[PDB]
Amino acid sequence: SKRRIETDVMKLLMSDHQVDLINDSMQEFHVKFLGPKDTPYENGVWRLHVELPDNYPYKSPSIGFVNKIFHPNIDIASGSIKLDVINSTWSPLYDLINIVEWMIPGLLKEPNGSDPLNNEAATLQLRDKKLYEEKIKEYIDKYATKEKYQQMFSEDLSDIDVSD
Amino acid sequence: KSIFNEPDVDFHLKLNQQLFHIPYELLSKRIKHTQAVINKETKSLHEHTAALNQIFEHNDVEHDELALAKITEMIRKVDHIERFLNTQIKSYCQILNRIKKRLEFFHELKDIKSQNEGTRTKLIQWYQSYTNILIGDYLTRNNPIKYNSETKDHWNSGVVFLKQSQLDDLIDYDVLLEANRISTSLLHERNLLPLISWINENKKTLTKKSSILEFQARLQEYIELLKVDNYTDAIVCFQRFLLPFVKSNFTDLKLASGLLIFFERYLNLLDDQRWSVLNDLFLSDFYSMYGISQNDPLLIYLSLGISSLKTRDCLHLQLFTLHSLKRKNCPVCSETFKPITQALPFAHHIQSQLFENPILLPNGNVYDSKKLKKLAKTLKKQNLISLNPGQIMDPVDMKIFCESDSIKMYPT
Amino acid sequence: MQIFVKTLTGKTITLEVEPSDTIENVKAKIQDKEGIPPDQQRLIFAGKQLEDGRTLSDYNIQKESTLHLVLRLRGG
Amino acid sequence: SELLDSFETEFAKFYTDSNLEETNLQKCLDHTHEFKSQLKKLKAHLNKHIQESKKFKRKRELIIEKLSKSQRQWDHSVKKQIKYVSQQSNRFNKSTLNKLKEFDIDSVYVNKLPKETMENVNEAIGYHILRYSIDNMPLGNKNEAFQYLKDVYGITNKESTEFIEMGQIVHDLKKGDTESCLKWCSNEMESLSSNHTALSSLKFDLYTLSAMSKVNKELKECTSLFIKEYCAAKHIFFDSPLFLIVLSGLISFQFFIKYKTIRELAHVDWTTKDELPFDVKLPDFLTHFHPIFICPVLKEETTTENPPYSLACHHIISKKALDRLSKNGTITFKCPYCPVNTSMSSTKKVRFVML
Ligand SMILES: [Zn+2]
Ligand SMILES: [Zn+2]
């Protein structure tokens, strides 16, 4: 089923989201992403690598971060996102614009420390919730800001009467 | 800030730019002609005043009378040039007024779009005028010209429609008429004379843009001079007009010279499709010269509109019920637009357009609760059918049900 | 006052609510008009999730707003 | 917008006043007129002098000098003015009309209409002209307007007598007489298939107008209501289809131009030929004509060959989607939107119909 993939990619394109295909494959590509305003991830700019399997509607897409982001449920050596909705609670109803605009900010605004993917991030989150913001700002600065995204990616006579 | 999602005024200006491109061409032609003739007349007056000054050298009575005669001639010439300038100014003002009226029209649109039930009606009226302009332009573009026995002025259905609808200044309707006249002369009358006159009038622009139209016209004339055997006239026309084209094209000239006594190289040369190929060349050159759009705008608008609202399910007592359905007023379902509807593609909908509170009946149809109740009340009041209290009736598949057998539905 | 809610699919729903109405009541109304149980149902206004305890008057409304309907998400 | 202001400010330079009455060439005309004036004056002076000659040497020298001094002034002033006209024209063109050539409308024209369907484009135009612009025609009495339409506009479509009668009765109503409209409404009331509430309201409006600044608004309301009621009663289109189609085409223009950019920027392929790729948003009075259902899982319209089916708890999905989720009616599954399991107890093909 390529119709669903094509429609989702077109829906992503027709908005302000910046989408770049790789070798025009139409099943794997990159999407630009901007941090949500309220959270400390406010000025950060990131790039996501997504890959859609051939059986896309009933198989979850593979999404990762090619930049560096600090988060308990997000890897540091890579950007392997891990949350249930994508992994085990995926219904053939969500879309790419939907998935980004709903559950990327959703995961950014609700970390879970029961079984995290980043151990040091979990330890920091459980200990202090005031210097975590300055850390995240810090790491964002060293790895992903606008500049980093730009770099890595006479006499006049008299008068005689006249005839009509 | 659009009312019903309509584009801004700048897009309207960009959308039909021929309306501003054609009057400018007429203005440029007027200015060029005036400049050339007035320079020539100035030179003539200069030589006149040199001769008169020479006449004044000899202080004699006879020479003085000759000088007075020369001054009289000068006055006559200046009166002539004054009349010419008056005519030119009279022609100038009308072409300026055309653009004035178009600008006022679009300014009225902008004023309407800068002020909602009361405002919507004004926009609808403005778009009615817009579609009238488009329809009139289409009708003027392609409709046979009917000659007038009185005043000998050409007229068409588009021209009379524009004159009667008070949209006179918004469409030129005369350069389009000239194009139609020349094109129909080429296609049907086979006259070929108006095209030659047009080429002669507009020879410099054709040479500057290096369009192969004068040579093609002369070649067609030469061929037409051999279908009926007039060998001396054919030879003299060849030597007078076809010769100066040796440098530009030589193989065609050699083939034309070979065509002097009447081999698949000749069916194309004597075929009738050459009349059209001269029409296509002339029309392309004319539209490039004036700026007229290569296609009829109304056709573009229809092509977009038909595919923009074509759905999948769009072609597949009793009288009132049949008229009660709301799917019998689709603008693209009508018997007039059916073949075009079949030709054009479908539409892309990303959301489901439906009604508010659906309920499903045992037969297998989903209706709207409030509308169904209102229909039942209307049927009961006018006595189209007798019903038990607390019952509903479905329009298609004539049947009656109770309110206890309707199941809620949740479209998504 | 009538307010609009936009769902994941895209469908927009208008509904009547009073400033004294609790968010549980809004969830019940959405349950009635959609059929999705209120427990797995969250609202989002100005990028902030809304809790059941607080009522509609706690968050300012201009009598014509655009809430967002959202499902449940959790990491692991 | 701003571009229209640019046109309006650059156009005013053609005239020489704020009232937009006098062009630039009038300077040429006045210069030539003045030139002729002093030519006439100097010739009459020559004659006064000749007749006297039958002191004067200088009197002749002034004439000789002036007669060549005026011609030079006329030449200088005239060439200057026509140059300034030409320079102004070229400046206006370059600075104003070169901002429009970026958009070529002809590039949008794909999926061209077949050449064999011009008999329908010329038939819808006739209907539109009959519906809207019939009052301006000098039709006069009936049975000659037929010849007028057939000879001038070439209109020979079926819905002609109804529109002619409609125009005649509307013109009569415009004079204040309400006998015709009342008789027609009373005649239409007899049948058992007419909208009685609308006819009753129209009769009440006619009664109020018959009893009677305020009249003009009532007259317009009664006229519009009669138009709507008659068009509904005679089974004809209140709004001509061509107008609605053109109004849709405008919006389609606005979105297409954008899609082609996203096409040049990122190269994408749309493999479904019969459906145009992008999406267009239409106003309220141009959408709800047919029931359109978009499947949540496949995001595709629902067709008679792909009927919609209702699950266990009354959600609606496609037919092939239900076949794929529950493979050929073998296993069960839950809704893609709520945790309620579904089996082959799913109801039959649900049919959406607009009431
Ligand atoms: Zn239809
Ligand atoms: Zn369900």
Side-chain angles (χ1 to χ4, degrees), chain D residues 63-101 103 105-114 116-138 140 143 145-155 157 160-167 169-171 173-174 176 178 180 184 187-189 191-194 196-200 202-203 206 208-212 215-216 218-219 223-227 230-263 265-272 274-280 282-283 285:
Chain D
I63 307 185
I64 301 172
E65 155 85 0
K66 288 268 304 176
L67 183 62
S68 299
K69 193 186 72 171
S70 166
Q71 193 264 10
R72 286 199 332 269
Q73 276 199 9
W74 167 74
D75 179 12
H76 184 200
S77 162
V78 159
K79 289 179 180 167
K80 174 181 301 179
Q81 185 53 237
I82 186 167
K83 171 204 305 180
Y84 290 178
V85 171
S86 188
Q87 262 172 50
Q88 207 291 311
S89 159
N90 225 327
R91 184 181 340 290
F92 159 77
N93 174 32
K94 204 162 311 303
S95 174
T96 289
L97 286 193
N98 272 114
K99 304 174 177 156
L100 301 194
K101 301 187 176 191
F103 182 100
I105 173 174
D106 275 299
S107 55
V108 188
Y109 192 33
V110 301
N111 303 110
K112 301 183 181 181
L113 304 201
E116 63 178 356
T117 78
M118 290 321 176
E119 281 86 10
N120 304 62
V121 178
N122 284 319
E123 191 145 349
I125 287 178
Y127 185 95
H128 171 88
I129 276 173
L130 273 181
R131 161 89 186 77
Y132 285 99
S133 291
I134 188 168
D135 296 278
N136 278 357
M137 265 186 248
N143 275 115
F146 269 78
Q147 168 208 5
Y148 184 91
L149 293 154
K150 277 169 187 175
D151 277 278
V152 170
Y153 292 106
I155 297 169
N157 59 6
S160 195
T161 68
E162 291 94 3
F163 275 119
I164 287 153
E165 179 209 11
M166 183 177 176
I169 181 175
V170 166
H171 184 291
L173 195 52
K174 204 151 270 184
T178 64
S180 45
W184 163 85
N187 191 12
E188 285 211 358
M189 185 64 72
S191 185
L192 278 149
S193 296
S194 295
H196 275 46
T197 187
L199 267 70
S200 71
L202 188 153
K203 256 163 98 161
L206 294 175
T208 53
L209 171 57
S210 168
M212 191 175 338
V215 56
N216 295 304
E218 273 198 0
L219 180 70
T223 307
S224 89
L225 183 62
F226 165 60
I227 303 301
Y230 190 45
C231 278
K234 282 302 167 65
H235 281 165
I236 62 172
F237 271 81
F238 172 53
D239 263 336
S240 45
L242 189 152
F243 170 56
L244 307 171
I245 290 174
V246 170
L247 183 63
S248 309
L250 214 57
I251 298 169
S252 290
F253 270 126
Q254 183 214 330
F255 290 64
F256 198 120
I257 303 301
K258 166 191 179 178
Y259 158 67
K260 281 195 310 171
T261 296
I262 302 195
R263 190 56 178 296
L265 263 49
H267 300 84
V268 287
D269 49 327
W270 178 262
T271 189
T272 306
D274 50 328
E275 174 178 358
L276 73 165
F278 62 106
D279 182 33
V280 62
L282 286 152
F285 68 103

Side-chain angles (χ1 to χ4, degrees), chain A residues 73 82-83 85 94 98 102-103 106-107 109 112 115, chain C residues 7-9 44 46-47 70-76:
Chain A
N73 283 246
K82 180 270 292 172
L83 73 165
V85 173
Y94 318 101
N98 196 318
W102 166 34
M103 65 184 74
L107 196 52
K109 283 180 270 191
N112 188 10
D115 72 309
Chain C
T7 72
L8 295 181
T9 180
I44 281 189
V70 171
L71 291 203
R72 168 170 323 196
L73 57 92
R74 186 47 57 119

Side-chain angles (χ1 to χ4, degrees), chain B residues 410, chain C residues 35, chain D residues 311-316 334-341:
Chain B
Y410 307 98
Chain D
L311 306 187
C313 77
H314 314 313
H315 288 107
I316 281 157
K334 82 162 172 72
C335 291
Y337 201 73
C338 54
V340 177
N341 298 130

